[PDB]
Amino acid sequence: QYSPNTQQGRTSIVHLFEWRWVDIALECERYLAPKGFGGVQVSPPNENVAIYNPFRPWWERYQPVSYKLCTRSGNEDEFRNMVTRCNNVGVRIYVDAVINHMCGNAVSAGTSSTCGSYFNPGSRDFPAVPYSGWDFNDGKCKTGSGDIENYNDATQVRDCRLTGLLDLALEKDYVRSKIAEYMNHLIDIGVAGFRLDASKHMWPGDIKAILDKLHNLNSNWFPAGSKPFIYQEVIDLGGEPIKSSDYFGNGRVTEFKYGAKLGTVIRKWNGEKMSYLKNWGEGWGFVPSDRALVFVDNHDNQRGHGAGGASILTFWDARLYKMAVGFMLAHPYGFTRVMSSYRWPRQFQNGNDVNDWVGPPNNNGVIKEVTINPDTTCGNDWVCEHRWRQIRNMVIFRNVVDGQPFTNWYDNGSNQVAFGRGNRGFIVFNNDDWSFSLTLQTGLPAGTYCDVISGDKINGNCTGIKIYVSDDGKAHFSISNSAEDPFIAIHAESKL
Ligand SMILES: C[C@H]1O[C@H](O[C@H]2[C@H](O)[C@@H](O)[C@@H](O)O[C@@H]2CO)[C@H](O)[C@@H](O)[C@@H]1N[C@H]1C=C(CO)[C@@H](O[C@H]2O[C@H](CO)[C@@H](O[C@H]3O[C@H](CO)[C@@H](O)[C@H](O)[C@H]3O)[C@H](O)[C@H]2O)[C@H](O)[C@H]1O
Ligand SMILES: *[C@@H]1O[C@H](CO)[C@@H](O)[C@H](O)[C@H]1NC(C)=O
Ligand SMILES: [Ca+2]
Ligand SMILES: [Cl-]
């Protein structure tokens, strides 16, 4: 469950948040495969409630009605087509599995679902699965409201309703079997793994019981004996009875302390400095690297819905965001996930965004297609951070230095630091309010290298900054605090 099952040489997955299946399929072929991306995390592919108040919010997809592959992203045929086409070019698909619960207990009964399935939350009736009243934890929860009221009580966190979402009785073999039936269907279609949504709200043992019912990956694309990659969403920032280590036996876990701490250091909050990142990783109290799934921001906290707070960096803070994402994929710790979002009308009132519910770009509820501009950027309000040169080139940087150790670290005691990865890569950062100009030891072979942040290596030439490494591995680096990207990165494949 710990191995991503990505093609050899690909070290990152991208979250194509709310993208349609047809758009992901051609993105796999036209960009992800040739640019070296390892895989794609897709939005929940199962039928969900259609919420019209507010109008089609992104979170309606986290309120299941059935396990039919039928959503605003597309139908089962479109989904299968995407998985086949992506796998055929070596790009894996990881599904966001919403298995802790069904929809809100207060939602009106009827057929307001992504494709007409009838459901009645009030009577706990979900005929399209099917699920009934004795398949939920209503009689198990011990809180007065029936919802989770205190995270300091590990029992209610697992047996009660998260914000009113009907809680499935995961201890029942019947329920475990229906969820496995759904996941095995996806596995047999060709998916390489899953993000277990709201894992903190499930008992580690119940999760394990479900995973024990899962098939090996499809033998038409993966080697015999391959197990699905599992990463559990557990928000553990340090002050609760539930620990992410409790889930190490089921697979990897999301390390939310990563993005929260990185945002604080890069923003230079409460006296933090980039020089403190020399021992970044377990040294900062993070989970073991081989159990960690890291990221700068996710679909929740980029809009204030999860954990991380105001320190979280996002595409809105473009300059600092590129630096954060750059440091993340240059650093050896964990398995990296890059975010890809859409633009929404952020309206901050009293410090809070009142439009944090706005769903994907659309026309009358119909999600807009991802259009590509001549400069390779996206239109139709899709941000496509994975297509930004600075991020895309760092994704390749991680592939190139895969396996190389962390070395040749340098820092000015403030916010100017640098380090290399064996003899295949070197990266320099300037986050101080003054210029950086110094000769550093890169550990790289002599030669001329193209900076992959300011440009690219095209036709035996660099379109941006050029670095010259001498016979002793030394090289001079100059970064003004006024640079549009205050960091330079060079690697073995950027050598001229
Ligand atoms: C959003 C996350 O909430 C929890 O996180 C808590 C931390 O665990 C805790 O340590 C502390 O920091 O507080 C936070 C916030 O409470 C969960 O642990 C975490 O799993 C969850 N993230 C994932 C799971 C859910 C649920 O599937 C997703 O939530 C989104 O979707 C729901 C459902 O639509 C939405 O709620 C809305 O609908 C309900 C219906 O009953 C309404 O009651 C509610 O008012 C509506 O807002 C959530 O707001 C939305 O965040 C999330 O996307 C996953 O990443
Ligand atoms: C690199 O660019 C220069 C012009 O700046 C040109 O003279 C040279 O031929 C180019 N090299 C290659 C290999 O195309
Ligand atoms: Ca639960
Ligand atoms: Cl996540």
Swiss-Prot record:
The protein's name: Pancreatic alpha-amylase
Origin: domain of life: Eukaryota
Catalytic reactions of this protein: Endohydrolysis of (1->4)-alpha-D-glucosidic linkages in polysaccharides containing three or more (1->4)-alpha-linked D-glucose units
Protein's organism: Homo sapiens
Residues annotated as the enzyme's active site: 197, 233
Family label: Belongs to the glycosyl hydrolase 13 family.
GO CC field: extracellular exosome; extracellular region; extracellular space
Cofactors required: Ca(2+); chloride
